[PDB]
Scaffold this active site. Sequence first.
Site, PDB file in Angstrom:
ATOM      1  N   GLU A  58      64.265  79.885  51.922  1.00  9.89           N
ATOM      2  CA  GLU A  58      62.787  78.818  51.467  1.00  9.89           C
ATOM      3  C   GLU A  58      62.628  78.775  50.314  1.00  9.89           C
ATOM      4  OE1 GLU A  58      60.471  79.077  55.436  1.00  9.89           O
ATOM      5  OE2 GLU A  58      61.005  79.688  55.467  1.00  9.89           O
ATOM      6  N   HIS A 117      62.004  68.049  46.565  1.00 11.35           N
ATOM      7  CA  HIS A 117      62.332  69.876  47.685  1.00 11.35           C
ATOM      8  C   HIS A 117      62.340  69.531  49.370  1.00 11.35           C
ATOM      9  CE1 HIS A 117      60.097  73.969  48.408  1.00 11.35           C
ATOM     10  NE2 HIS A 117      59.989  73.551  49.381  1.00 11.35           N
ATOM     11  N   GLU A 118      62.185  68.790  49.635  1.00  9.27           N
ATOM     12  CA  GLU A 118      62.215  68.145  51.382  1.00  9.27           C
ATOM     13  C   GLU A 118      64.076  68.257  50.825  1.00  9.27           C
ATOM     14  OE1 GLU A 118      60.548  69.104  53.665  1.00  9.27           O
ATOM     15  OE2 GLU A 118      59.091  69.845  52.094  1.00  9.27           O
ATOM     16  N   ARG A 123      52.784  74.528  41.553  1.00  9.76           N
ATOM     17  CA  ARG A 123      51.712  75.821  41.750  1.00  9.76           C
ATOM     18  C   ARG A 123      52.746  76.731  41.262  1.00  9.76           C
ATOM     19  NH1 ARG A 123      53.976  76.658  46.756  1.00  9.76           N
ATOM     20  NH2 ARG A 123      52.117  77.897  47.829  1.00  9.76           N
ATOM     21  N   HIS A 130      66.279  70.914  50.873  1.00 11.47           N
ATOM     22  CA  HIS A 130      65.759  71.838  52.191  1.00 11.47           C
ATOM     23  C   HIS A 130      67.455  70.019  52.493  1.00 11.47           C
ATOM     24  CE1 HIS A 130      63.830  74.504  52.278  1.00 11.47           C
ATOM     25  NE2 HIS A 130      62.836  73.373  52.021  1.00 11.47           N
TER      26      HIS A 130
END
Length: 1287
Positions: free
Chosen positions: A267, A229-230, A369, A233
Amino acid sequence: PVTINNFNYNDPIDNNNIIMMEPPFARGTGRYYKAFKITDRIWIIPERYTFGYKPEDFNKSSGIFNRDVCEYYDPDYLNTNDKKNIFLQTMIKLFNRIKSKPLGEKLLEMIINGIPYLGDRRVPLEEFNTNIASVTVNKLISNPGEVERKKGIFANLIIFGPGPVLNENETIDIGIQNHFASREGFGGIMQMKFCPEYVSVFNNVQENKGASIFNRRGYFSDPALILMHELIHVLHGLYGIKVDDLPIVPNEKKFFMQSTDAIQAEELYTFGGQDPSIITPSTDKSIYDKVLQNFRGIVDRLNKVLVCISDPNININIYKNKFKDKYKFVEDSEGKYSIDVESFDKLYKSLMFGFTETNIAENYKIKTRASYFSDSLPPVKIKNLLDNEIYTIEEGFNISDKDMEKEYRGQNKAINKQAYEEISKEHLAVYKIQMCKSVGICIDVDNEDLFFIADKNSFSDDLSKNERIEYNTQSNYIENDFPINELILDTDLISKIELPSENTESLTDFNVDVPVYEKQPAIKKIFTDENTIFQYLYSQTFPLDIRDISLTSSFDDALLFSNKVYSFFSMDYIKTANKVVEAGLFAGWVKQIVNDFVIEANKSNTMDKIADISLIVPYIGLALNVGNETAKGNFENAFEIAGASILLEFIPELLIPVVGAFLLESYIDNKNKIIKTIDNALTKRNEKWSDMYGLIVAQWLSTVNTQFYTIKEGMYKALNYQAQALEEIIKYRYNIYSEKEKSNINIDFNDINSKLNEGINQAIDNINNFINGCSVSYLMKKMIPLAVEKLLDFDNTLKKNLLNYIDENKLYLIGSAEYEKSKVNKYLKTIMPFDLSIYTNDTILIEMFNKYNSEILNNIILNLRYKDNNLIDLSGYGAKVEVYDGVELNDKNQFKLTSSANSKIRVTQNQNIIFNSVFLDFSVSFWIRIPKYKNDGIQNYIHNEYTIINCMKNNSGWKISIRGNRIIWTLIDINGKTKSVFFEYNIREDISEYINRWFFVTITNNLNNAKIYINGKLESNTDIKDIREVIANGEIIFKLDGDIDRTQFIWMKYFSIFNTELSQSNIEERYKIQSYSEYLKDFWGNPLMYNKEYYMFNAGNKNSYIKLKKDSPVGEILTRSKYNQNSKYINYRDLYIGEKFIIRRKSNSQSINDDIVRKEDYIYLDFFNLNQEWRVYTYKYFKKEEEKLFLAPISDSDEFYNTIQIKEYDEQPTYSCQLLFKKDEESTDEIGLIGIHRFYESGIVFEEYKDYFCISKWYLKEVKRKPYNLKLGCNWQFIPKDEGWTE
Ligand SMILES: [Ca+2]
Ligand SMILES: [Ca+2]
């Protein structure tokens, strides 16, 4: 491929793959960090991230850094060489897991090859400047104890250990002089603070974690997904596309609103799933344009770059070749670079919508999630990621040979407990809102339990801007989608272009902006005397030091006494729960109260079909008192009136812009461009409708669906509190007993909890379905229509605009000044239907939508119902209903239209409902009672047609009229063409099923036919294919209009309109539903009453009636008299004949006023014999199958049964009822049913057969047969005098 290097923390520095680095935020001043190259351009520094943090802030305090995170603190993490080495090996394992699949390997390769441009906004276009903090980082070569020699190196990513908060992973870009290279197309060295062991926990709202409210719930995260996930980014920051734009900001004006940091579109893109849908199409295009513009600047630089002043050793061509591949620019035969729209579009979508946490999770079969906007829970610590029995490179936690591949069992907290450890709450910091009452009692509420409601400033107003329509103008749509499969198979996606050497000249300009972080209060005090969701939930809890509690329905007492716990379940449930019994009766009481709990919870499946509401959870209001004081009054009734809106804690102020005008550019003489311009305006118009819808969806998801999410979680907490409370009581009561007593008590706590838990799970499913239905209802009824209004207005404006354009340019359109106008007219006619799947591909959202659309009741666009002495529309679209003074209304939902000019109802329908589906498609349903003709007025009755309901606009529409015994439905299209279909009931029947009797009407219309259904059965049909458009949303006027007699009137009930064609199945169902009643009906269809004179009718002997025989206590059966006059048009049998009966109540001496006769009631069937009231009896001792009833004065005799039970054996709609004589109310001994029997009589002079009023056992078996025999002589109806029937 991607090679992951291996190494141990204690390995020697070699100044190549193991170095002493000077991190960007160090500003080139002291302190170097031992760094390890895990892959080309990627470094790992196994130490805490301290830049911008105070040393003491690494300790848990009374403060917090982020208001929406359960922050874990531990200053000892990574404080030893061995801990650092574990971190290294763990990072190595995670990178291996990442590349174990093509998708993740591709992510890594894109990151390694996405080298930052050599420079930033300050660098001349003609140059490459490596001497800036975002491009070069220094390594110390000199021996330990001296900054003697330093060498520079290019890098892409530097991963540090965590900052103060272990579970708060973050990616940071480098800003210099207030600007970020990573946000302007250049890209720059990226940094990350990461912790692999302390991962987040989440739990699906709809899904039940192994469904165990007594065990741990939720799932823990796979650290490899967290890392990826990071890395996404990082990827965005390296390609310089981490642009800033209009962010989602939470409204914080109310005390119940959740406070969080602004959320950038990037995001939400990174997360994927439904989150991108919260970013409007307007903002999506704004971001796309900004990135594209940034790339135009880079492509220009590549065409102008000539030298690199900072590093004479830089090979210009190598870098130009590399940057061309990075940004996917095209290069002509002479080396000229340019942007290729196709390649750019593919690169952009791959980066923003291809690599997303959701997409990666799905590909790696990792559970995560559902949304960025889901509640945050306390993290857990993974015991040992380096242990292959618990975590593997190939499968993560979900190891197949451990049988944990299915349903992500390996990440399930209740299932894989060996994998993790709970965290000490002592080290957790959570932002809380302390809500204290005025003097005052104070309640702490986690900021996460509050409602997240996006502020209106979160959305773009670009739709309000004007647009120029050129001949080459084109509409643009950005699909927030991307074929993950094509990404995985995309060949040229990955570079095959040489990666330049990382060594370069040492950095001397350390200019850089370093973020400064500070904790803020972990508790915020706010004053409020409101008792909303938070207080209601709170009243359902009890302190840890208390073990003896009692339940109460008093919210206020629950707040006041620590030993009193609030319960929203029934009075009885509460009573039984507080009951204390002897040990010998304890097991019995436990089974009883547990069963009662399940029953109470299960009331969540309550239906309300008569109000056109399939599902409703009746106790939601009492449980939370959320929204507009939903705990007061009857929740079901409040919902029928206002719907989903009453549950919202806050009604959002929506942004619904006036669409900007269109400025069509003129091309005099040129006809081709003129035509193109016209079409472009049209296509663009659609982009406007689509974008508007997208704007609505974004707001719905971030301001409305979020509130309904909080409510769903609230009900889950509420039900659990109830179960926990009942469990506390059961334990307390059980422990009051001695050990000897306990030994003989048959109780199984595991079974008790199993049963309570199952009941909760069932309730939860119903609640989730109910709430999702409410959310979609609000979207479709309270949001979309408001958008449609603005859009229709826009269409009109544009229509005028275009037509005019056709006129001013007709002198250039020669033979098309006509053809163009027609195309425009028809285009701005058919509006765009709303389809949620166009703005999102999230499975739960789509199925939520599809479900709603599959429920026929959501097609109701008008539903006139009685409420508070008035008629109002409960369809949810808010029609204006004006009921004038001459209309009689009653609480039985019946209304009367008379001959008075003021006996009228005016309905102004909502103009923003998709009613015009291009082709007619709607139904009208209602009940009606039409009075019998006046015998001396038959000519006019059959001759004069009068309208009763008219809906016309611009001379087009529909109307319902009546001409005597015929009801007519008429349509009129825009061209005045008319067509009608009608139902006519016979007026020569001895006994009519329709004259002056309530009956159900349903008219359906589709592109081919118009049909009339009566009482569920199809009666008439007309072909209406020749009917053009029909305007149906005009004003609806309910009023008798024509040459009517002054005594003429009509009763109506349940008038409703559906914007679709009802099927015979839907109609039959509606008939049965609206026919249902606990009470019996009279001949006319009205409620049967006590103390009301009635003549008696027999459905099995229509033309027969009862009369007391002259000198015999029996009822003789005679033949009804008939219409006597000479009219050839009518015939009937008299109804007001025979004895006048009257029904009396058996029990309760509450006098003989009046009341409703209900099925199963015990009654006395009496009648008037002159000035006396007689009764119907049954001689007790007859042995034959049947016998004549005994009619005589009121009296009590042991020889006669006098009590009757009124029954309804027919399961289908009917006005007939049956009368049963039972030995007594309690016994099950049936004497027989009241009917008519034939007897033979042979006297000295007369010989013949005669029928009498009797009781017969034969009927008992006959009423059981299916289908019900309507012709049985035991079927009776009661006929009271009625103004609608004269004879
Ligand atoms: Ca979007
Ligand atoms: Ca209490």
